[PDB]
Design a protein around this ligand. Structure first.
Ligand code: ZIA
Ligand code: ZIA
Length: 513
């Protein structure tokens, strides 16, 4: 427990944020203590911001140069000077609120200097502003209208759709409409995007899009462009896997099987080609401990910052300092940076707490902890999930107080490895009993069993099909859970291998359908 006075002495960090949030939620921050407090908050977002704003609303913040502009309304905007008129017309809701005669007037006013404003004003004088903006091929207007309302939907011709990728909004547009299976005319139109005009994630999602319309040759061309342009080897491998699945070129599979990235795709390719399992590093420090406190959340925030700012030389000093059994998770974390992310570290710390579970359970626990925290006992997420297994306070308290009735339980007990692994086992029993597959369990661990149940109830998810279950894995509608599932599944395969309880990843894939 930390008073606001003592917290204010600590460096700004997620740990300090968490402990400030704990005071706010227990009503221990007075209006007077609240006055300076946002200079003490490292990430002023979500619940900490809503809680603080209940004590001290934000009057902030309109830019003082344009103050006067915000004194007009739709009824008086024709009395405003030209700068004021153009500032207020940045808002499409403001434009929508205008009467049509004033939209006509303002459109004429702005036609020479701001034809973008003209196009939007006249668009809103029609019953379908999107159709007007599309006829003009006003790309900036298109994205403004999309951000205003996701309900507009229209066919887009080859020329227009090939202009969209140059706008910063394209990537989120494409991803959202493909994954959410919305805006079907937009989605169908995006089949005519030239792969030459897209790259990376956008190219990849356009591949996925093409597969949903069974346009396999277009899909291949998008995935090939993605494989060529993606920065990360793990993403390139995902793209190459699709190239292989669609066109069956055995050079694509061979390239995938020789990847330096360990991921589900490279593991699968290795299995299909009878390639040996990738080499896993063995870390076995003989030193037992050092002076570092693995149970101090503030100390972790500080050493993490140091490690991530350390030059090649400082990483070697830190490596030596943390080369002990007690600080093994910090050691592996340092080595991962020091070796430029080329070696595979799959540690098993605090193993005494799980050695009596069966090996398949051990592997799933380890797989989850590796992705959740990298085994850092005092890990804290941006949403204040806690410890090695990244329990949200709600769940920690439900399990620790309601279910297990641990005397004097506090959510900070999640920072103790014994508790993290015990609670993790407890919750994984609940999930696995309902879902079975380690991939589904992973999705429910990160995203909730409600989300997972709803996804699996759909007719179009994890059912039989030409490109299943891989296609479904690309369409998991929450990006954090989609990524999380792929990573945890790879880790699970590795840990099962390391525990002498190997499973073929092909058997996992068969059990998904
Ligand atoms: C400490 C923390 O923020 N962990 C989050 C993790 O972060 C991934 C990387 C970066 C930091 C780390 O330990 N692993 O991503 C998971 C989703 O994939 C989340 O559920 C976890 O809460
Ligand atoms: C381990 C845990 O607390 N999981 C919960 C998750 O926590 C969000 C982040 C933290 C770490 C992670 O993997 N997901 O939030 C879901 C949505 O509210 C809940 O349904 C889950 O039970």
């Amino acid at each position: 427990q930390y008073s606001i006075e003592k917290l204010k002495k600590e460096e700004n960090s997620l740990a300090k944020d968490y402990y400030i949030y704990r005071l706010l939620e227990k009503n221990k921050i007075s209006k007077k203590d609240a006055q300076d407090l946002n200079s003490h908050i490292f990430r002023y977002i979500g619940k900490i911001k809503s809680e603080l704003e209940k004590i001290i609303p934000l009057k902030p913040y309109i830019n003082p140069k344009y103050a006067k502009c915000y004194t007009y309304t739709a009824n008086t905007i024709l009395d405003a000077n030209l700068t004021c008129q153009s500032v207020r017309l940045n808002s499409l809701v403001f434009i929508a609120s205008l009467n049509s005669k004033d939209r006509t007037t303002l459109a004429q006013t702005f036609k020479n200097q701001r034809p973008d404003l003209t196009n939007l004003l006249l668009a809103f004088n029609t019953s379908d502003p999107m159709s007007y903006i599309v006829q003009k091929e006003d790309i900036n207007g298109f994205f403004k209208l999309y951000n205003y309302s996701k309900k507009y939907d229209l066919d887009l011709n080859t020329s227009l759709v090939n202009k969209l990728p140059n706008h910063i909004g394209f990537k989120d547009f494409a991803q959202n409409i493909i994954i959410k299976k919305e805006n079907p005319k937009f989605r169908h139109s995006m089949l005519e995007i030239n792969p030459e005009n897209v790259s990376e994630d956008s190219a990849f999602y356009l591949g996925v899009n093409a597969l949903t319309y069974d346009k396999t040759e277009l899909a291949y061309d998008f995935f090939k462009k993605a494989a060529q342009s993606f920065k990360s080897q793990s993403n390139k491998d995902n793209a190459i896997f699709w190239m292989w699945l669609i066109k069956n070129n055995e050079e694509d599979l061979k390239t995938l099987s020789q990847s330096s990235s360990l991921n589900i795709y490279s593991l699968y390719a290795k299995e299909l080609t009878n390639t040996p399992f990738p080499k896993i590093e063995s870390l076995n420090p003989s030193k037992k401990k050092n002076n570092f406190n693995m149970q101090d959340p503030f100390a972790w925030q500080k050493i993490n910052k140091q490690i991530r700012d350390a030059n090649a030389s400082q990483l070697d000093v830190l490596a030596k300092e943390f080369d002990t059994q007690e600080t093994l998770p910090i050691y592996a974390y340092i080595l991962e940076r020091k070796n430029n992310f080329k070696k595979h570290y799959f540690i098993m710390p605090y193993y005494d707490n799980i050695k009596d579970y069966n090996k398949t359970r051990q592997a799933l626990i380890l797989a989850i902890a590796r992705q959740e925290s990298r085994f850092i006992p005092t890990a804290i997420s941006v949403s204040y999930a806690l410890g090695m297994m990244q329990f949200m306070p709600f769940l920690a308290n439900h399990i620790g107080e309601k279910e297990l009735k641990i005397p004097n339980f506090d959510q900070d007990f999640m920072f103790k490895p014994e508790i993290a692994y015990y609670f993790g086992n407890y919750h994984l029993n609940y999930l696995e009993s309902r879902l079975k597959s380690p991939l589904f369990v992973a999705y429910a661990y990160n995203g909730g069993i409600g989300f997972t149940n709803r996804m699996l109830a759909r007719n179009d998810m994890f059912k039989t099909g030409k490109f299943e279950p891989f296609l479904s894995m690309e369409l998991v509608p929450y990006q954090e859970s989609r990524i999380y599932g792929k990573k945890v599944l790879a880790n699970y395969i590795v840990y099962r291998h390391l525990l002498n309880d190997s499973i073929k990843i092909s058997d996992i894939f068969e059990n998904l359908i």
